[PDB]
CSV table of N, CA and C in Angstrom, one decimal:
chain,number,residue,atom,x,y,z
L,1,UNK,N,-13.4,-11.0,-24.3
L,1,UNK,CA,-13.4,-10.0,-25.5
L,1,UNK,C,-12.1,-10.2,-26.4
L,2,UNK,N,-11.2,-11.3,-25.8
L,2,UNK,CA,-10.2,-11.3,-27.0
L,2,UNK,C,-8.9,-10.1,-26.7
L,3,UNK,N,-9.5,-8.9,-27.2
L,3,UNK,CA,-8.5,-8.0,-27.0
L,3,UNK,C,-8.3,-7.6,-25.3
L,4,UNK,N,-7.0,-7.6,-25.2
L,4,UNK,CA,-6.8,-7.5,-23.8
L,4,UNK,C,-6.0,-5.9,-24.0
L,5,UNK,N,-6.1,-5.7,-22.1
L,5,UNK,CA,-5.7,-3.7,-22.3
L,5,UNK,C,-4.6,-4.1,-21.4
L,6,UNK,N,-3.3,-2.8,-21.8
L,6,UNK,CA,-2.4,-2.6,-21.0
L,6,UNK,C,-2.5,-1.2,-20.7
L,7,UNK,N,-3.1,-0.5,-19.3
L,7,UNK,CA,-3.0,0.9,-19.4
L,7,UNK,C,-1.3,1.4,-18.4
L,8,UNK,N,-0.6,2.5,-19.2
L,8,UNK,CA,0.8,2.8,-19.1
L,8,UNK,C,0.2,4.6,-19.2
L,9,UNK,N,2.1,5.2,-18.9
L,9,UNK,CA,1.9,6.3,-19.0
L,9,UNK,C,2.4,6.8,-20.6
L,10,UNK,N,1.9,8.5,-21.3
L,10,UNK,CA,2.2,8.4,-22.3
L,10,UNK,C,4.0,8.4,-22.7
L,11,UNK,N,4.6,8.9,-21.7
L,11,UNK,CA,6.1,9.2,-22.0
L,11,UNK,C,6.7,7.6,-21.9
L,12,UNK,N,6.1,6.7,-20.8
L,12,UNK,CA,6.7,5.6,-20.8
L,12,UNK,C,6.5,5.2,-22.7
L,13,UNK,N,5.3,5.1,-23.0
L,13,UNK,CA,4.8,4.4,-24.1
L,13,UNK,C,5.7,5.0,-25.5
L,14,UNK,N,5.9,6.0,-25.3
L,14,UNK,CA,6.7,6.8,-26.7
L,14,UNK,C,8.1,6.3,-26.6
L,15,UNK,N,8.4,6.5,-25.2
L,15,UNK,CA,9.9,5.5,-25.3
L,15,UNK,C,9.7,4.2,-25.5
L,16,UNK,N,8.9,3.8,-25.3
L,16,UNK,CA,8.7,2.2,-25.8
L,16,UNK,C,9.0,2.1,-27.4
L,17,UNK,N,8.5,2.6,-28.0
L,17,UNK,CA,7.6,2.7,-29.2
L,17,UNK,C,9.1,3.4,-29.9
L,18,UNK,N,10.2,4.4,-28.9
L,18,UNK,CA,11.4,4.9,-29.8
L,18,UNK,C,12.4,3.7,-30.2
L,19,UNK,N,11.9,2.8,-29.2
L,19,UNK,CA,12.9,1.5,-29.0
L,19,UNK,C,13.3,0.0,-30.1
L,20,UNK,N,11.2,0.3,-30.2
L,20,UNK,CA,10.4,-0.7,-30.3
L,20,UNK,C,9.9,-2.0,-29.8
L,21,UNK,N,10.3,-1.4,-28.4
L,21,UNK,CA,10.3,-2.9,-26.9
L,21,UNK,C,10.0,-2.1,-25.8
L,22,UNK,N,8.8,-2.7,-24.9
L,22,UNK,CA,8.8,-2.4,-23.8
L,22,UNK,C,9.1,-3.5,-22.9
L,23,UNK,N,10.2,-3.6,-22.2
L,23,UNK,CA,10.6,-4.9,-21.1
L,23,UNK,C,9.5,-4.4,-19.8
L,24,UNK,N,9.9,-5.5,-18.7
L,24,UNK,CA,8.7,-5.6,-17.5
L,24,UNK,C,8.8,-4.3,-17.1
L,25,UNK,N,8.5,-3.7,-16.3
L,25,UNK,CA,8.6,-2.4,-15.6
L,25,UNK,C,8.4,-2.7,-14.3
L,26,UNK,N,9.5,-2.2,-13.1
L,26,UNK,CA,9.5,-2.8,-11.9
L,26,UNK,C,8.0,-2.9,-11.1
L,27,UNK,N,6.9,-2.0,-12.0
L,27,UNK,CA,5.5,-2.5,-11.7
L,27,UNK,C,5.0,-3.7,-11.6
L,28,UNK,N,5.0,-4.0,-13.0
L,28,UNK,CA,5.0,-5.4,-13.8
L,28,UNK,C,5.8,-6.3,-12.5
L,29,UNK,N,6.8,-6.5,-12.7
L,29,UNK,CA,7.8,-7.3,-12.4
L,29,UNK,C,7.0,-7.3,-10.6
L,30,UNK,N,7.2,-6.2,-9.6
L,30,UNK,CA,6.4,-6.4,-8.6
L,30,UNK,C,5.0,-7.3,-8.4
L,31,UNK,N,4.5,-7.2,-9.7
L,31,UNK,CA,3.2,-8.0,-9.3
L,31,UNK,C,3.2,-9.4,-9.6
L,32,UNK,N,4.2,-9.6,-10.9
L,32,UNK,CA,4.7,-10.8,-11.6
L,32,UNK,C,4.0,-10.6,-13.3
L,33,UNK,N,5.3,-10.2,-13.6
L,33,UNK,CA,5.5,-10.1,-14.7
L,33,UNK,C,4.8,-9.0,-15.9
L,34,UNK,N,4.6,-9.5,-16.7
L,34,UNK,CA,3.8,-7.7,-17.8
L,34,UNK,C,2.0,-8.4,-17.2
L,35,UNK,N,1.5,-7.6,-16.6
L,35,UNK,CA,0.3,-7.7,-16.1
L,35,UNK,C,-1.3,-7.2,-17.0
L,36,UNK,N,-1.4,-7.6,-18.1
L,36,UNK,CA,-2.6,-7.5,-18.5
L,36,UNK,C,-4.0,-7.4,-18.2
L,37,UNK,N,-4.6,-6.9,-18.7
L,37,UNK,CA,-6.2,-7.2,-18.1
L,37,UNK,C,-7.2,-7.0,-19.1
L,38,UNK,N,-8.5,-7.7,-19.2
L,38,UNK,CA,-9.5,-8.0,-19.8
L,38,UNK,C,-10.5,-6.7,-19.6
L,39,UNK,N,-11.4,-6.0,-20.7
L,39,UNK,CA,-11.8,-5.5,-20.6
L,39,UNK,C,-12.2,-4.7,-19.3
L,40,UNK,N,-13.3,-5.4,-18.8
L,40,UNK,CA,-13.9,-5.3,-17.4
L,40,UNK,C,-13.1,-5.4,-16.4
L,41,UNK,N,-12.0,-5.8,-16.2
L,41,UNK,CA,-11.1,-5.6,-15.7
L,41,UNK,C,-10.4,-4.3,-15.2
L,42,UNK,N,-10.0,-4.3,-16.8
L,42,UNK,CA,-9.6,-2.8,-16.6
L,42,UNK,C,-10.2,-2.0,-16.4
L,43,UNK,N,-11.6,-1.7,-17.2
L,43,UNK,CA,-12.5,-0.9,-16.5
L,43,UNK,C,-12.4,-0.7,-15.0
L,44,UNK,N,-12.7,-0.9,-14.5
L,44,UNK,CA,-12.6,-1.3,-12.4
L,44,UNK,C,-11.5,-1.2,-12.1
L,45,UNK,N,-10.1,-1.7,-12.8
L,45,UNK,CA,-8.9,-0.7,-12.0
L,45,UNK,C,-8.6,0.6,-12.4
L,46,UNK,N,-9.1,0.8,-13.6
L,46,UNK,CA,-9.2,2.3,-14.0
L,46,UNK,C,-9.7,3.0,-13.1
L,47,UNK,N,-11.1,3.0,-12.2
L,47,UNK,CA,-11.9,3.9,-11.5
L,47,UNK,C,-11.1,3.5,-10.3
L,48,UNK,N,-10.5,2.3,-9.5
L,48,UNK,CA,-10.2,2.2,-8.6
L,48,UNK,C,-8.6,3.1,-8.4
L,49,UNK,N,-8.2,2.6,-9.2
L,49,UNK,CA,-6.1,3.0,-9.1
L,49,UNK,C,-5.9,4.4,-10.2
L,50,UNK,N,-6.3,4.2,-11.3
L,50,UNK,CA,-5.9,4.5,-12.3
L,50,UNK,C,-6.9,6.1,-12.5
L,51,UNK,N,-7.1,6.4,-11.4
L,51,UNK,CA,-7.7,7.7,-11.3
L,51,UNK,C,-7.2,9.1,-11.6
L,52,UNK,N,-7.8,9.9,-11.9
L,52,UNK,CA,-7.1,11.3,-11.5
L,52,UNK,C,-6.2,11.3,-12.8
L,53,UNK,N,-5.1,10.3,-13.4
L,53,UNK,CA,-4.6,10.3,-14.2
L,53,UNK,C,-4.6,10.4,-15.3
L,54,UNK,N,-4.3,11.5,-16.2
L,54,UNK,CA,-4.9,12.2,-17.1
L,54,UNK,C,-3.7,12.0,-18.2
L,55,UNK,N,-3.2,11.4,-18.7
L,55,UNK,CA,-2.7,11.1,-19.5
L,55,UNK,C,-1.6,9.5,-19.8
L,56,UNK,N,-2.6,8.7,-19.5
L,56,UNK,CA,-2.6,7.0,-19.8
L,56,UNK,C,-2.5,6.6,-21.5
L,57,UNK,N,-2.0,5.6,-21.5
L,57,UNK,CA,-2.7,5.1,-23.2
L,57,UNK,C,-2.9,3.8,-22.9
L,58,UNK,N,-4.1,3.5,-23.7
L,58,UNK,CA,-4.6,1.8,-23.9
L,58,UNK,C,-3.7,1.1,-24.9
L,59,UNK,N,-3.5,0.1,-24.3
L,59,UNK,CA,-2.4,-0.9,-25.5
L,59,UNK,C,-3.0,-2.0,-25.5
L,60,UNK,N,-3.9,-2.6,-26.3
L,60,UNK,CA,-4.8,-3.4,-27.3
L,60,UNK,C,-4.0,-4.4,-27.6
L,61,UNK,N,-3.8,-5.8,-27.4
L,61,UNK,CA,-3.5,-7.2,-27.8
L,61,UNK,C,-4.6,-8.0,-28.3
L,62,UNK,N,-4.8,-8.7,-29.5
L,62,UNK,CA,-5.8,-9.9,-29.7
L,62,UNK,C,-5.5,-11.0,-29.3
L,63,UNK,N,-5.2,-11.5,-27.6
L,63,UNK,CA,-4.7,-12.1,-27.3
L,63,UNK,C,-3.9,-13.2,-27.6
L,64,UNK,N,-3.9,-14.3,-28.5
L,64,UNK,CA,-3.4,-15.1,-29.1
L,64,UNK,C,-3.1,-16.1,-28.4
L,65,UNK,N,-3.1,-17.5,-28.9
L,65,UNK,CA,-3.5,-18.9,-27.9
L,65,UNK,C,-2.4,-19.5,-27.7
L,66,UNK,N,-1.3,-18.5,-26.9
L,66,UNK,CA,-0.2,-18.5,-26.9
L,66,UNK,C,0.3,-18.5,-25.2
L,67,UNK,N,-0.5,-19.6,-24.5
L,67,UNK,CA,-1.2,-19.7,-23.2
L,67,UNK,C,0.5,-19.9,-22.7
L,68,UNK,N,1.1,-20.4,-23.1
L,68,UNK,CA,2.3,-20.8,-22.3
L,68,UNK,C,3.1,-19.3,-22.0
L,69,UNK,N,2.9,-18.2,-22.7
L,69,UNK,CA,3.6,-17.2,-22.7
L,69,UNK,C,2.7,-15.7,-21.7
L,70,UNK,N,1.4,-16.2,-22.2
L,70,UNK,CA,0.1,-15.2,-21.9
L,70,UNK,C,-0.7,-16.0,-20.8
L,71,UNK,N,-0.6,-16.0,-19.6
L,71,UNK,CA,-1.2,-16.8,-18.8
L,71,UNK,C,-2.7,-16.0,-18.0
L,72,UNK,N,-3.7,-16.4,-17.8
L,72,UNK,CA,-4.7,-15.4,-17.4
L,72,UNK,C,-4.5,-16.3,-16.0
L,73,UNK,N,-3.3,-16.0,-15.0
L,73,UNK,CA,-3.2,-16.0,-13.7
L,73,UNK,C,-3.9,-15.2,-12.7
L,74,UNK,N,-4.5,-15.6,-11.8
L,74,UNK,CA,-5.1,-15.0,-10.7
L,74,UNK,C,-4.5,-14.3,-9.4
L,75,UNK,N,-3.9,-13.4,-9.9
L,75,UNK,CA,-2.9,-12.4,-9.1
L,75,UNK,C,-3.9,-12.1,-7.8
L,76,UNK,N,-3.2,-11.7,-6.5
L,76,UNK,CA,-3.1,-11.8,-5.3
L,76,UNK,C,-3.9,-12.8,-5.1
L,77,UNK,N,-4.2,-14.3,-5.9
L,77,UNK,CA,-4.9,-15.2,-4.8
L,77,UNK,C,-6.4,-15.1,-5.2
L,78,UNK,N,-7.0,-13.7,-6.2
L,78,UNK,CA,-8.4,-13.3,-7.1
L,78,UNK,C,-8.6,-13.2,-8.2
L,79,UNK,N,-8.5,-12.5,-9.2
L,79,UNK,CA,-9.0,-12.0,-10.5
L,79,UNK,C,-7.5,-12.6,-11.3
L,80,UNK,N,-8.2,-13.3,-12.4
L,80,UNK,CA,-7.4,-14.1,-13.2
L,80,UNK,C,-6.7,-12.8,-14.7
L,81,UNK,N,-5.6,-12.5,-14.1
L,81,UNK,CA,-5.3,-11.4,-15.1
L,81,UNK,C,-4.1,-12.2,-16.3
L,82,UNK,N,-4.8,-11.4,-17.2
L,82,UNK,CA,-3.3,-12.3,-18.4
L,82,UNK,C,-2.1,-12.1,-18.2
L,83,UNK,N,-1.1,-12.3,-17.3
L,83,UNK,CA,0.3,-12.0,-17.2
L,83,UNK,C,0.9,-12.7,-18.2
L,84,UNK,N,1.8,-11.7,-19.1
L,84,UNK,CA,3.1,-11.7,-20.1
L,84,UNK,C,4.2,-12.4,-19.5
L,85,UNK,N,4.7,-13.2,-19.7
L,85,UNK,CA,6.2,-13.6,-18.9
L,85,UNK,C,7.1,-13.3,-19.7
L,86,UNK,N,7.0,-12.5,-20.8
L,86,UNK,CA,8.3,-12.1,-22.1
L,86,UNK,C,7.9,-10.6,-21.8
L,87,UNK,N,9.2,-9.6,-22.6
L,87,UNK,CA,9.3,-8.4,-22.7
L,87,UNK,C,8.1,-8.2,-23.8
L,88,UNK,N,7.2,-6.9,-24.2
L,88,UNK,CA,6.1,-6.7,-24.4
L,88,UNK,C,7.3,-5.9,-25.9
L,89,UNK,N,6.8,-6.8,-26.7
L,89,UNK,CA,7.9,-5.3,-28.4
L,89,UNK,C,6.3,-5.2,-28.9
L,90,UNK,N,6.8,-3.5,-29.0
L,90,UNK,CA,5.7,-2.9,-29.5
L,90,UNK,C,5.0,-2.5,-31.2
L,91,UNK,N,6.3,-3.9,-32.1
L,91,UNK,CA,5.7,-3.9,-33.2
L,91,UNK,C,4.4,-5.6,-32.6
L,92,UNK,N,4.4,-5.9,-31.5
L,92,UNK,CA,3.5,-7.3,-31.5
L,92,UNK,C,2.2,-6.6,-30.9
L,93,UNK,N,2.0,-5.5,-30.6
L,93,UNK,CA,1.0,-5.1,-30.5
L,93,UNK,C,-0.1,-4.6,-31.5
L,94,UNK,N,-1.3,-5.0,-30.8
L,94,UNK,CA,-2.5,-4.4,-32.6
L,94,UNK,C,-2.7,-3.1,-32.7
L,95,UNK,N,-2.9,-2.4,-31.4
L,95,UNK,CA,-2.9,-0.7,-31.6
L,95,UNK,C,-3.2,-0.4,-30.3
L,96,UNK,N,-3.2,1.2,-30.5
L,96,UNK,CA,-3.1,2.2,-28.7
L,96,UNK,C,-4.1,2.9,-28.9
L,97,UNK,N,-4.5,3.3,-27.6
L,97,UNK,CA,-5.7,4.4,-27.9
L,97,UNK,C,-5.3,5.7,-26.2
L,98,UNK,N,-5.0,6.9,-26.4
L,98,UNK,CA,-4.9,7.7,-25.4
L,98,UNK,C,-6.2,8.2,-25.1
L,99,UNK,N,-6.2,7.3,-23.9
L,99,UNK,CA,-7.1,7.0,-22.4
L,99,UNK,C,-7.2,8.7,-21.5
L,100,UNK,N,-8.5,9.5,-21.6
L,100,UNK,CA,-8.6,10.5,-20.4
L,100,UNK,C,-9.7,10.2,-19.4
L,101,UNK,N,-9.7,11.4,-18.8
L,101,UNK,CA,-11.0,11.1,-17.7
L,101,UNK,C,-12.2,11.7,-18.0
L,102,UNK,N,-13.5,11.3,-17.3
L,102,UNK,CA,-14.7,11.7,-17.6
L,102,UNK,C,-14.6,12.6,-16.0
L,103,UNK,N,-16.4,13.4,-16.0
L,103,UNK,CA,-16.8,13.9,-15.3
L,103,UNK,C,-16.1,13.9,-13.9
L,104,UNK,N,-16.2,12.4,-13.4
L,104,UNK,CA,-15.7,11.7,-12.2
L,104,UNK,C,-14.4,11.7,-11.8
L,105,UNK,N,-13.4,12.0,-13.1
L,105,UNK,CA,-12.2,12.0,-12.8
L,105,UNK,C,-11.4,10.3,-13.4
L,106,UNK,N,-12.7,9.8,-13.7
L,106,UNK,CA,-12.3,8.3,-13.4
L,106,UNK,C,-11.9,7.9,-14.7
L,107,UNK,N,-11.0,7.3,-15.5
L,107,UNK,CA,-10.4,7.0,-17.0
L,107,UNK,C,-11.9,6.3,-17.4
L,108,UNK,N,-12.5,7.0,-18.6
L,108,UNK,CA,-13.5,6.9,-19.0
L,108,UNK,C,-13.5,5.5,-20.1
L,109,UNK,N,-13.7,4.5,-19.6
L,109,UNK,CA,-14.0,3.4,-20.5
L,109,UNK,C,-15.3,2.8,-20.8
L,110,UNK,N,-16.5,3.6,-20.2
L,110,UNK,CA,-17.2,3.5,-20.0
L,110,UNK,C,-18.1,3.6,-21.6
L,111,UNK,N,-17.5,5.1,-22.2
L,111,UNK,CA,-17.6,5.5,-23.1
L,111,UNK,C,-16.8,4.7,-24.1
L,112,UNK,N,-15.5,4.4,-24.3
L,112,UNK,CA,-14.8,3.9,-24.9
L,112,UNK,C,-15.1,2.4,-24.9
L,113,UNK,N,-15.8,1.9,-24.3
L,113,UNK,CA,-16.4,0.2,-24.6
L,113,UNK,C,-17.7,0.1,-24.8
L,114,UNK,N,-18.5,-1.0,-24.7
L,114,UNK,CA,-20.0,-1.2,-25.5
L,114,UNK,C,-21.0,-0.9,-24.1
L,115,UNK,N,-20.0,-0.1,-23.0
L,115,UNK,CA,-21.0,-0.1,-21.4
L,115,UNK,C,-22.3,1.0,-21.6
L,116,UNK,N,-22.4,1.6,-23.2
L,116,UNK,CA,-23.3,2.2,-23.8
L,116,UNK,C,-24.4,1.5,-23.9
């Protein structure tokens, strides 16, 4: 799909945004490096991890063929996620969208993508 999702919390993201840089987050950096993901992707860590959590924002990249920086690496050994190896400044982002939950509790992207 091109646009790739970063889901964060909102107070992280507004400090980001007071900055206008978000560096790795010992999250990030634990898994290896700013950890992206593709649509479908996220969708499925959203319902798996990213539950319950009621106040996320989506952060929208059009990825850019910028493979030496943006790598779609296959973290733990499975799923090929686009890891960032640079700090993430949040004028290089295309836009955000604040992410809640449906019915299930589960961050609703379901609604928010074409799973219509």
């Amino acid at each position: 799909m091109t646009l790739i999702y970063k889901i964060l919390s909102r107070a992280e993201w507004d400090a980001a945004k007071a900055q206008g840089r978000f560096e790795g987050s010992a999250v990030d950096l634990a898994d290896g490096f700013i950890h992206l993901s593709a649509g479908e992707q996220a969708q499925e860590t959203a319902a798996k991890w990213f539950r319950g959590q009621a106040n996320l924002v989506l952060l929208a990249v059009e990825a850019e063929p910028l493979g030496e920086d943006l790598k779609w690496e296959a973290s733990r050994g499975g799923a090929r996620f686009p890891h960032l190896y640079r700090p993430l400044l949040v004028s290089e982002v295309t836009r955000e969208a604040d992410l809640d939950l449906d019915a299930d509790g589960v961050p609703q992207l379901g609604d928010h993508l074409a799973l219509e």
